Amino acid sequence: MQYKKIITSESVGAGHPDKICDQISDAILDECLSQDQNSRVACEVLACNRLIVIAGEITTHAYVDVVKTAWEIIKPLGYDENDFTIISNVNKQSVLIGAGDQGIVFGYACDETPQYMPLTSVLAHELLKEIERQRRSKEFIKIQADMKSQVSIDYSNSTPLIETMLVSIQHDEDYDVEYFNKKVSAIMEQIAKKYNLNTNFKKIINSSGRFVIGGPIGDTGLTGRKIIVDTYGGVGHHGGGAFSGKDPTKVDRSASYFARWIAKNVVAAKLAKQCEIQLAFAIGQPQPVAMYVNTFNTNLIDETKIFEAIKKSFNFDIKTFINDLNLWTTKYLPVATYGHFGRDDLDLSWEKLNKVEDLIKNSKH
Amino acid sequence: KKIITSESVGAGHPDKICDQISDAILDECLSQDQNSRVACEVLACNRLIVIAGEITTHAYVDVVKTAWEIIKPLGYDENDFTIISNVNKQSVLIGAGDQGIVFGYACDETPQYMPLTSVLAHELLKEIERQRRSKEFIKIQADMKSQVSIDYSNSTPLIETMLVSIQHDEDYDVEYFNKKVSAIMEQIAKKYNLNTNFKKIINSSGRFVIGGPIGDTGLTGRKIIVDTYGGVGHHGGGAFSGKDPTKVDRSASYFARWIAKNVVAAKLAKQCEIQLAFAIGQPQPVAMYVNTFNTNLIDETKIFEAIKKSFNFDIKTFINDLNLWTTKYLPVATYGHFGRDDLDLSWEKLNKVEDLIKNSK
Numbered sequence: 001m002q003y004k005k006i007i008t009s010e011s012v013g014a015g016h017p018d019k020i021c022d023q024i025s026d027a028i029l030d031e032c033l034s035q036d037q038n039s040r041v042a043c044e045v046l047a048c049n050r051l052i053v054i055a056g057e058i059t060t061h062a063y064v065d066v067v068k069t070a071w072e073i074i075k076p077l078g079y080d081e082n083d084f085t086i087i088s089n090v091n092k093q094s095v096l097i098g099a100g101d102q103g104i105v106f107g108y109a110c111d112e113t114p115q116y117m118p119l120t121s122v123l124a125h126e127l128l129k130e131i132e133r134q135r136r137s138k139e140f141i142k143i144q145a146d147m148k149s150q151v152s153i154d155y156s157n158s159t160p161l162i163e164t165m166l167v168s169i170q171h172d173e174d175y176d177v178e179y180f181n182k183k184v185s186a187i188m189e190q191i192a193k194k195y196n197l198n199t200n201f202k203k204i205i206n207s208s209g210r211f212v213i214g215g216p217i218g219d220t221g222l223t224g225r226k227i228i229v230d231t232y233g234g235v236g237h238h239g240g241g242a243f244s245g246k247d248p249t250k251v252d253r254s255a256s257y258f259a260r261w262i263a264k265n266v267v268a269a270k271l272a273k274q275c276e277i278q279l280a281f282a283i284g285q286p287q288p289v290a291m292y293v294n295t296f297n298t299n300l301i302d303e304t305k306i307f308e309a310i311k312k313s314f315n316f317d318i319k320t321f322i323n324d325l326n327l328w329t330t331k332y333l334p335v336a337t338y339g340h341f342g343r344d345d346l347d348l349s350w351e352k353l354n355k356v357e358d359l360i361k362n363s364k365h
Numbered sequence: 366k367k368i369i370t371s372e373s374v375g376a377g378h379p380d381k382i383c384d385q386i387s388d389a390i391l392d393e394c395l396s397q398d399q400n401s402r403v404a405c406e407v408l409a410c411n412r413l414i415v416i417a418g419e420i421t422t423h424a425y426v427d428v429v430k431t432a433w434e435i436i437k438p439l440g441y442d443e444n445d446f447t448i449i450s451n452v453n454k455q456s457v458l459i460g461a462g463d464q465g466i467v468f469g470y471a472c473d474e475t476p477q478y479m480p481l482t483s484v485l486a487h488e489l490l491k492e493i494e495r496q497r498r499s500k501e502f503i504k505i506q507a508d509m510k511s512q513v514s515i516d517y518s519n520s521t522p523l524i525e526t527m528l529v530s531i532q533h534d535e536d537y538d539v540e541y542f543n544k545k546v547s548a549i550m551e552q553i554a555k556k557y558n559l560n561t562n563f564k565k566i567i568n569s570s571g572r573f574v575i576g577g578p579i580g581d582t583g584l585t586g587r588k589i590i591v592d593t594y595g596g597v598g599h600h601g602g603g604a605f606s607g608k609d610p611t612k613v614d615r616s617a618s619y620f621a622r623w624i625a626k627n628v629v630a631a632k633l634a635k636q637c638e639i640q641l642a643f644a645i646g647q648p649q650p651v652a653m654y655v656n657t658f659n660t661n662l663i664d665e666t667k668i669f670e671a672i673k674k675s676f677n678f679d680i681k682t683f684i685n686d687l688n689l690w691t692t693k694y695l696p697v698a699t700y701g702h703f704g705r706d707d708l709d710l711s712w713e714k715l716n717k718v719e720d721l722i723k724n725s726k
Contacts, residue, residue: 240590
């Protein structure tokens with residue numbers, strides 16, 4: 001059969017139940033870090049049918065109404081006080097940085113897009129962002145906030161082709177299918193044209209045949225059940241830690257950002273076409289207990305000199321890299337939709353190409 | 366140095382309590398009704414356990430009773446938790462029920478055809494748990510974590526570090542506890558014929574009396590890397606526990622493992638990873654990618670040919686070929702879903718080597 005090399009990634013919209021939970025988790029975190037930059041937050045959410053359970057462990061001087069915050073995320077998606085029961089079992093308290101958990105994180109970067117992210121990811125996110133922009137401006141009417149995208153790209157040749165764009169969008173009972181299909185097709189062609197790609201791909205629109213019920217209603221959502229949508233869409237490895245609802249002292253989050261920041265800067269500095277960085281942690285240890293730099297035989301100089309330049313260019317102290325990425329004063333709600341990485345539409349510290357100068361100098365040029 | 370690291374967690378870990386309750390409820394349903402649809406999720410937050418999700422079954426199931434059957438053996442009693450259900454239960458579509466991507470992975474580092482980091486991490490916790498049950502290792506509890514770093518700088522892998530964290534009784538003897546863990550680490554090393562002089566990190570937090578969900582949270586499907594390839598293989602994002610075979614997140618991930626393992630066993634590659642993508646209503650994967658990491662012993666194109674000729678890509682058919690309707694899932698809710706030489710999983714059977722060899726000429 002032989003074929004072809006076909007890589008695929010997905011995204012989900014703000015109304016997807018798994019992502020409602022990530023949004024509520026990070027909104028509660030943002031509320032705490034506003035008032036108290038020393039807040040400890042480990043906030044998890046279950047959205048099951050018409051019951052939302054907010055849980056976890058918070059230490060903060062901040063006044064926070066976890067239920068009120070949850071409604072502030074839900075209401076804009078079109079729900080009202082009649083749609084959910086929302087309850088808290090959150091345990092709230094007052095009063096060098098060692099890791100607070102064991103575990104592994106992965107940073108990843110490549111040169112396929114201006115975002116230094118895989119093309120599959122970028123196209124999947126961009127589809128849903130444009131559909132959501134059009135929903136808010138009423139350019140695309142009679143749709144709702146729960147949606148999913150999936151983009152398959154054919155890497156058989158020098159130049160990537162789009163093989164398939166798939167979309168599922170929650171629609172009103174009384175929608176016009178002809179209108180809806182035309183709107184989605186034109187949006188798919190618009191996104192393709194924006195990354196200068198082929199226009200002639202297979203289009204799969206609402207293949208289930210009907211999508212009126214969405215969000216948590218027939219269904220379940222939980223915090224940290226979109227950890228691949230949140231990262232590198234199956235192109236990069238993952239250590240298993242979820243991001244949303246965690247303050248910067250959880251190395252699951254801050255080290256994953258730190259590693260992205262390295263990877264992106266390694267590729268930007270033309271040391272490699274792709275770079276993946278594994279950090280492992282041990283409870284009480286102020287630096288990663290282990291490190292692996294994978295460059296997938298795309299290194300443009302010696303693998304050994306890349307490793308040297310990374311060790312010389314970055315501080316691996318957890319407290320220090322937390323401060324260097326201003327993670328205590330970063331807004332997290334914006335990265336709870338459409339991924340944590342390559343957000344040319346945001347202003348994330350870990351996406352800044354402010355270490356290329358240092359890597360070039362520290363690579364014996 | 367090239368240092369890869371993976372982890373495992375014990376039966377008492379709150380994330381894994383939830384996976385266990387999810388799969389126990391599934392097993393209870395499939396016992397009575399082999400046509401059950403189960404999408405069961407669990408939140409364990411402090412002393413409240415919420416069982417949720419979507420079940421269609423003819424089976425009589427008490428989800429709360431089933432949850433207590435997982436909890437009580439870990440040492441808890443009726444006074445420790447409030448357990449409530451918001452499960453939407455009912456009585457009585459073609460092809461995939463969801464979009465998504467899965468990844469199957471296999472390598473030749475272990476008899477399990479799994480990464481050494483994973484195997485060592487799982488084996489450590491299984492031996493500690495066996496010793497807890499036989500009272501060979503006293504004054505410990507069921508919440509535990511392992512993390513194993515292996516040095517792949519040379520032809521021959523070295524162990525760099527073994528880390529263990531085990532919940533202990535208030536009145537334990539540190540010297541006893543550290544001696545027990547050291548000897549277990551050396552035993553696991555000797556068992557895979559590895560070096561014996563590595564770094565040993567034993568309860569580095571300094572104290573681990575409180576564990577499980579107490580003062581913490583667990584959720585179903587928050588150990589999806591422990592459950593799979595420990596960071597060596599890619600992941601599509603789908604969690605396994607609490608899902609009947611019609612969820613391709615579960616059955617396709619098994620199907621792909623079964624391919625990968627058999628590709629490596631047939632000496633076609635030292636490593637094999639298989640990506641399958643799905644679309645709602647489509648009876649087969651909508652896309653497939655075969656990665657062999659430049660370890661192929663034959664042409665990449667002929668490996669792809671032999672896979673397509675040797676396996677049925679019809680979702681209903683591969684479900685039946687792996688006897689997923691009559692498979693017990695609770696056993697794979699601890700210590701990973703793959704390379705379980707201690708179990709009898711259909712997707713671990715080397716019964717496709719003959720077919721791949723023939724279909725590669």
